[PDB]
């Protein structure tokens, strides 16, 4: 229904998130964070955000 997943910041990717797609597989690949990630903005730009649950 509604599980709670919560966005946190990802210290492997920096810069610029373009692609939540990419996002979303660079968490599931580099951790453990199979809901993947989103595209989040944070100053100064648009970071990858995985997605853990809570």
């Not at 229904?1 to 660079?26: E, N, R």
């Not at 580099?30 to 997605?51: L, N």
Request: hydrophobic share 20%; net charge positive; with cysteine.
């Amino acid at each position: 229904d509604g599980v709670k997943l919560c966005d946190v910041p990802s210290g492997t990717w920096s810069g610029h998130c373009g692609s939540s797609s990419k996002c979303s597989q660079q968490c599931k690949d580099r951790e453990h964070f199979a809901y993947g990630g989103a595209c989040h903005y944070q100053f100064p730009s648009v970071k990858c955000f995985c997605k853990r649950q809570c």
